[PDB]
């Protein structure tokens, strides 16, 4: 179901010049926006920080 | 500066014929919900006055214009419509041009009230709304012209069309849908007056039955007087009871409802300066509100 | 009437949250303490 | 009063990168090309068993 | 750029479709209020100093 969030949208034009990069990592490809109590569930279970 | 100006934003998608009519409507009266800087044009249009379901009639437009707030459009940018409200923005500036939609000419020093377009139209195609502009005609005619159109509706259940102001003819008849648009005002007249002329006739059981022209004056004068003799000149003092005292209150509220409607207060007075006194149809007239 | 953007890179470190989902790193924040804390505004 | 007619940045360039060999479906193929083919009527393949 | 396929049938594709999309943006404008009191004006101006 979480993969269904990531695969239901097409990669969209256009590329930015100033890509939001990580420490030693690939640039960020998407943003989740959740409420406060769901975020506590999605970190103590099902996912890693 | 310190002048107040409402800014009405037009949604984009205007066709070249549609902006030309909005270019032409420079000095006109436009209502709005609340005094505010920025505002959409959807609250300006005639579609915003509806209750259903139902496009509002002449009675509702008189009721709306108390709650709506009058404003006169200034110069019309292609970006936005800049209009100033009458009741707050004009107290600092003092002078606003105003074009008549009325066929009746304006003399100097006249008080002008606003009348909904019952005397007898702009619609926009691309933006899907209508515009109805009220008629700025003078306030002594305003109590007349409304009451002439009511008198026609009582005849639906001599000439009423004659109205000669400052040396000019007027034709009220000019037809079909004007009569049915005004039908709701006619019924609240007759229901108010006949309920008036039963309760007074029940509290005084012999107004009509009293003798003519000399006893009635003697009954009038003692009632007209100021002296302490008041209540013994009035009142007449299983079976059902006429609910008179409750019918007092329901009639007084209905009469008290129509006092705000048919006052037609002088919102606008015109002071002609550096020009002709007579302001005719399609001419910008300067406006000075009460200080 | 034709004009083009000018952008300059000035990167700073920001405390945030990164979640790996599938094949791409996904950003995740909640926006309660940062924004809308103690206002009269509903959370949309 | 200022009027502007502005066209913004045309930020849409759709790119398509195709190579049949970058697809590993060419494992399932024997791709050879005739530099000119269409003159030929009937090519045949002999199997000896 | 609409991507295309040469379909195996010799039936004609009759036309490809390649066109330009134009979108009107929208506009909204924000609001705030800063209001100051009566006597705060003269103190900033200096009338009550």
TrEMBL record, chain A:
Identification of the protein by name: Major capsid protein
Protein species of origin: Human herpesvirus 1
Included stretch of the parent chain: 247 to 295 of 1374
From TrEMBL, chain B:
InterPro entries documented for this protein: Herpes_capsid_2
Alphabetical keyword list: Capsid protein, Host nucleus, Virion
Top-level lineage group: Viruses
GO molecular function, one term: structural molecule activity
Gene Ontology CC terms, in alphabetical order: viral capsid
Any matching Pfam family: Herpes_V23
Name of the protein: Capsid triplex subunit 2
Gene it is expressed from: UL18
């Amino acid at each position: 179901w979480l993969v269904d969030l990531t695969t239901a949208t097409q990669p969209s034009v256009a590329v930015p010049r100033l890509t939001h990069a990580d420490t030693r990592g690939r640039p960020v490809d998407g943003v989740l926006v959740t409420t406060a109590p769901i975020k506590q569930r999605l970190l103590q279970s099902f996912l890693k920080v | 500066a310190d002048g107040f100006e409402t800014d009405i934003a037009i949604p984009s998608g205007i066709s070249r014929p549609d902006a030309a009519a909005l270019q032409r409507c420079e000095g006109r009266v436009v209502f709005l919900p609340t005094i505010r800087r920025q505002l959409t044009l959807a609250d300006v249009a005639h579609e915003s006055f509806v209750s259903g379901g139902v496009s509002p009639d002449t009675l509702g437009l008189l009721l709306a214009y108390r709650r709506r707030f009058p404003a006169v459009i200034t110069r019309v940018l292609p970006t936005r419509i800049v209009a100033c409200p009458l009741d707050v923005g004009l107290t600092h500036a003092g002078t606003v041009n105003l074009r008549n939609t009325s066929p009746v000419d304006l003399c100097n020093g006249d008080p002008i009230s606003l009348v909904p377009p019952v005397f007898e139209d702009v619609r926009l195609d691309s933006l899907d709304l209508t515009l109805r502009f009220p008629v700025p005609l003078p306030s002594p005619l305003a109590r007349e012209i409304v009451a002439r159109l009511v008198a026609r509706g009582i005849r639906d259940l001599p000439d009423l069309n004659v109205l000669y102001y400052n040396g000019s003819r007027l034709s009220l008849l000019a037809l079909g849908p004007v009569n049915a648009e005004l039908r709701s005002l006619v019924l609240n007249m007759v229901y108010s007056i006949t309920e008036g002329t039963t309760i007074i006739l029940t509290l005084i059981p012999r107004l009509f039955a009293l003798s003519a022209q000399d006893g009635y004056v003697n009954a009038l004068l003692q009632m007209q007087s100021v002296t302490r003799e008041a209540a013994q000149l009035i009142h007449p003092e299983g079976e059902r009871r006429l609910p008179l005292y409750e019918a007092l209150v329901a009639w007084l509220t209905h009469a008290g409802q129509l006092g705000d409607t048919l006052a037609l207060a002088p919102v606008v007075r015109v002071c002609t300066f550096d020009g002709a006194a007579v302001v005719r149809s399609g001419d910008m007239a300067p406006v000075i509100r009460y200080p | 009437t034709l004009d083009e953007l000018e952008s300059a890179p000035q990167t700073t470190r920001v405390r945030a949250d990164l979640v790996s989902i599938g094949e791409k790193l996904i950003f995740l924040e909640a926006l309660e303490k940062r924004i809308y804390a103690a206002t009269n505004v509903p959370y949309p | 009063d200022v009027e502007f007619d502005a066209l913004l940045g045309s930020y849409c360039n759709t790119l398509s990168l195709v190579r049949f060999l970058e697809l590993g479906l060419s494992v399932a193929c024997v791709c050879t090309k005739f530099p000119e083919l269409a003159y030929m009527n009937e090519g045949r393949v002999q199997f000896e068993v | 750029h609409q991507p295309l396929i040469a379909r195996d049938g010799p039936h004609p594709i009759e036309q490809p479709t390649h066109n330009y999309m134009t979108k009107i943006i929208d506009r909204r404008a924000l609001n705030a209020a800063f209001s100051l009191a009566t006597e705060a004006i003269a103190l900033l101006t200096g009338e009550a100093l």
